[PDB]
Design a protein around this ligand. Structure first.
Ligand SMILES: NC(=O)c1ccc[n+]([C@@H]2O[C@H](COP(=O)([O-])OP(=O)(O)OC[C@H]3O[C@@H](n4cnc5c(N)ncnc54)[C@H](O)[C@@H]3O)[C@@H](O)[C@H]2O)c1
Ligand SMILES: NC(=O)c1ccc[n+]([C@@H]2O[C@H](COP(=O)([O-])OP(=O)(O)OC[C@H]3O[C@@H](n4cnc5c(N)ncnc54)[C@H](O)[C@@H]3O)[C@@H](O)[C@H]2O)c1
Ligand SMILES: NC(=O)c1ccc[n+]([C@@H]2O[C@H](COP(=O)([O-])OP(=O)(O)OC[C@H]3O[C@@H](n4cnc5c(N)ncnc54)[C@H](O)[C@@H]3O)[C@@H](O)[C@H]2O)c1
Ligand SMILES: NC(=O)c1ccc[n+]([C@@H]2O[C@H](COP(=O)([O-])OP(=O)(O)OC[C@H]3O[C@@H](n4cnc5c(N)ncnc54)[C@H](O)[C@@H]3O)[C@@H](O)[C@H]2O)c1
Ligand SMILES: CCCCCCc1ccc(Oc2ccccc2C)c(O)c1
Ligand SMILES: CCCCCCc1ccc(Oc2ccccc2C)c(O)c1
Ligand SMILES: CCCCCCc1ccc(Oc2ccccc2C)c(O)c1
Ligand SMILES: CCCCCCc1ccc(Oc2ccccc2C)c(O)c1
Lengths: 267, 267, 267, 267
């Protein structure tokens, strides 16, 4: 068990194709004992999570809610037992209003929409860290989910900006987490067929956006020297468990590419 | 005259040590005809700008004001004469509440403060572009001011995150500006003794912050293979005029380092 | 005249579609007085260079020849007049044996071939600098030609490795050049139809290589937010003259992308 | 056992403070069965390797020797048993003549010296891959040792250029290795007190070089958000075993920083 006896908080499960769901599953297969957080649709999330290899408390967390944040650590400690701490935290959370994405002009997204997106997608990495570092063990790991924003691309639009912000935040979180002996890192994943991605591909953000997204997926597996299967989230779950383990002890404020190697290849 | 007969909008002048002020001065020395925008203290800015080599209309612009943005192009066209367009736009604007900077813990900046910062420092590059592209000429140039955020550093804190966002925005603005034959780029400057920098160094953000800022300035001139004078903004003004000229016609969505070469050297 | 009264050494002219040829032409249009160097086919190069806007001495230079290097500065000073120095140096030189490129397996290039390539394409930037810095003026500029090697690509193969080396060398040359008040930088160009590129596209390195090169050119203009014309070397000549001018005084050990903005865009 | 029943080739052991030695030790602790290669001083290396947790064949390999390379796979297969293949390959090899390093001027390293360095330090990653890929299993991993060359630094000089080349080579090796289902990646380590590093620090490359190296080590632990112990190679051995394991299946042609997070922090 890569994660034997480690205690890990996992956020961002919404369906059974969530990257968070596969992160959780793999971790439990590797002996981790889990605590889960969900946003808003808790009966759905309970129902979905009942299918994991093992039982795990589910805690409500709206990342934009001050009270949820303020009460989070107490709730976790309650769930894992007093005198016990977390060895790992997983941030698999994101959101951007439609106006900030797809065939909707870049220039036409109101700041209030862009602000909400950055709030949930970037700022919350800092917020969760703030709430949870006090109840983490030395040797601990924090992991967030990333999509390489170092270049502009069609349709991703303002989410790219949110990911750029996130990478920056991750480096500062690394500075804070360090005072606790805790690592902080991001996993940069290739495209995966999830609820959030289904939106885009299915034309809910405009048909041309859906088309560019599809071309994206296809170019990816082409570039990837080992290929890329956008229906299989396991390779990125396995990568996230690696960061949660003891086997990358000298890495922090850093980005790990679980993308088939695509970003290293121009063509 | 590098900028003979070009029409250039310059924002961000607040004192006579503003990077924007030296940008404006150099440009006029190079034959540009200017239009200026200022935030809030317009009598001060008029008074300051009266010292430029030549007269130039001053227009009010609060980057967070919808009406200012909406009316901006009409006001400019009024100032430069109907049937005339802009050949250049300079964004030299930034702001971050104290909570997001210095010895104030990273984790203690409220999102409302961080949001305001990103609004003025990143989002506004898109906002200005949106308002001004319609009245720009093909061959035109947009330039923003940057401070290399690719690594975390003490004290800069949330402004770094804002700069990360800005670089991302710049790449998307490049996509829009391209439809007009207009370039968009950022200048990444070394440390310059300005009002905004005086804050930091002078301990208004905490003494330890002031001390780290001073160490920063010093390491900079050390690393720079040609050195760095933090009292002299001319080298970065000259660099911004280069981008505004016809001599970098094949560059866009890109970052130019006016930093003495510091970022290319580890030690 | 951007380059009025500046004295500039330009290497790498072989035909009239050489990037070096267009660099030279633009510079002379901008008032520079030139000295030229050529490799091996000097009658051809004389004949080609007779078509520049103005007369300019031609000096022999095999970059792998110790004597040429050793005698270079004496020959230049002879050409520009004693007591006169160089304000600029242009490195537009490259070579890689066929074994290191195209459909010829990466693994099948003998080190002796790869060594020759790196010698001429990377190491020589240091060699020229060494020979010429002693006869340069403060305020001076050295410029090399680059093709962004930060990612792997088909066919470019070992030349990519040579370009990676070159970028590294450029940063160290910046350290040396700095002791003289001289800048050193690279221009990263998009694809241009030259003799060296004609090889590749024309199938002399294998048909599949020719095909990947053609796809490359096409994706480029697609990605470029302002487009890209691979038949027009002027935009990169103009960019090289900018670096040779006084208008980027705070840039060194750095890379400037004259690539239409392509590298900033994923899709 | 992270590496249970995997067969791994490890190169670059010279003393018991070699990164390769600690790589080998950790791997065996994790259940790997090993084959070792050494350069030139084989009695020394045998003697040193006798101290590993388990016995492992030692094979001679001069990376510049064509016959060694040509015969390598036959020798390995002989050592691991016919019908058995390698699951992992470790490249922990480097060399640069003194002229290319330290207080010896950058400009004064003869190409023949720089060529030898690049041969052993960069080119050999391709050479080993070429010799060994045919006897590797799908799911396999190749790992090389790196020192982040993205910026210039004192004293490292031409080794930096060699590391720049190596990173480039790694991306192309990823393309070849991919045809076999094999990953290729580099580990970028922080400073470690080894034989090769002892040289530098001890003034054998000049006292000023020794002094800059010492300052380097010190700045490192300062920048590292989790710190850095230059006497402890275990954290980078653990990181190399992670890449050799099944837990980073979607990473290739890539670089992993085992550097305490130093490269992510400016100050
Ligand atoms: N699917 C891809 O292709 C891909 C690739 C790289 C990175 N990522 C990243 O992976 C992470 C998870 O995305 P996914 O692909 O699994 O989609 P998803 O729909 O399965 O999960 C996204 C998560 O965001 C959570 N969330 C949204 N608003 C919230 C709020 N206000 N408070 C708390 N939680 C909130 C949702 O409830 C949900 O569980 C994201 O950060 C995403 O950007 C996805
Ligand atoms: N001084 C440095 O060391 C340095 C280095 C690199 C980059 N920069 C960047 O250069 C630019 C200018 O900064 P500076 O050093 O000249 O400081 P400065 O004080 O001279 O100018 C900053 C500008 O922000 C403007 N501004 C703030 N809020 C605004 C709003 N709501 N609407 C419209 N304008 C607003 C101010 O009025 C002011 O003119 C910034 O974007 C900054 O981050 C500065
Ligand atoms: N054409 C492109 O698409 C492109 C794009 C980006 C960068 N570059 C770079 O631009 C530079 C010039 O290439 P080009 O496109 O003009 O091709 P080119 O054929 O016009 O010029 C290449 C130059 O290399 C010189 N050279 C080769 N071996 C030499 C030696 N031993 N000693 C002295 N000189 C030697 C040649 O004589 C020649 O003039 C190169 O360094 C190249 O890699 C080209
Ligand atoms: N020690 C550090 O601080 C550090 C940091 C980052 C990366 N690295 C890299 O780690 C790797 C190992 O270096 P080290 O620190 O363990 O020093 P080391 O002295 O322990 O090992 C270096 C290896 O190079 C091998 N070698 C040299 N020439 C060879 C040849 N012609 N053929 C075959 N093998 C040859 C040596 O025999 C030796 O085992 C290198 O590639 C190095 O650059 C070292
Ligand atoms: C541009 C076409 C390529 C698609 C990128 C892949 C992807 C898919 C889903 C992603 O998650 C989100 C996307 C938007 C908003 C919120 C989330 C979680 C995500 O962050 C990335
Ligand atoms: C961290 C210590 C090093 C100082 C960095 C130099 C600097 C100085 C002033 C800058 O402008 C701002 C800084 C904060 C908020 C707003 C602006 C314009 C700025 O963006 C950068
Ligand atoms: C891989 C398909 C894309 C082509 C890249 C464009 C290009 C064209 C010519 C170039 O110059 C050389 C190429 C090889 C060897 C020598 C030189 C000068 C060069 O460096 C780059
Ligand atoms: C510049 C001062 C900082 C030292 C860098 C750390 C280091 C130490 C040893 C290294 O290995 C070599 C160094 C030179 C030549 C050969 C090798 C293996 C190496 O590659 C890196």
């Amino acid at each position: 068990g890569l994660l034997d006896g480690k205690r890990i908080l996992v956020s961002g499960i919404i369906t059974d194709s969530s990257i968070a769901f596969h992160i959780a599953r793999v971790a439990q297969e590797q002996g981790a004992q889990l605590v889960l957080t969900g946003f808003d649709r808790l009966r759905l999330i309970q129902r979905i999570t009942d299918r994991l290899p093992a039982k795990a408390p589910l805690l409500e967390l709206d990342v934009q809610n001050e009270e949820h944040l303020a009460s989070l650590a107490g709730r976790v400690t309650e769930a894992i037992g007093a005198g016990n701490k977390l060895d790992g935290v997983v941030h698999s959370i994101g959101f951007m209003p439609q106006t900030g994405m797809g065939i909707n002009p870049f220039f036409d997204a109101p700041y209030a929409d862009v602000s909400k997106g950055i709030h949930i997608s970037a700022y919350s990495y800092a917020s969760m860290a703030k709430a949870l570092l006090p109840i983490m063990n030395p040797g601990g790991s924090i992991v967030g989910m990333d999509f390489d924003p170092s270049r502009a691309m069609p349709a991703y639009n303002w989410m790219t900006v949110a990911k750029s912000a996130l990478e920056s935040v991750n480096r500062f979180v690394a500075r804070e987490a360090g005072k606790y002996g805790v690592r902080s890192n991001l996993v940069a994943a290739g495209p995966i067929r999830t609820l959030a991605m289904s939106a885009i591909v299915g034309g809910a953000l405009g048909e041309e956006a859906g088309a560019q997204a599809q071309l994206l997926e296809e170019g990816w597996d082409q570039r990837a020297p080992i290929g890329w299967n956008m229906k299989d989230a396991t390779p990125v779950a396995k990568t996230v468990c690696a960061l949660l383990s003891d086997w990358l002890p000298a890495t922090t404020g850093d980005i790990i590419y679980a993308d088939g190697g695509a970003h290293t290849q121009l063509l």
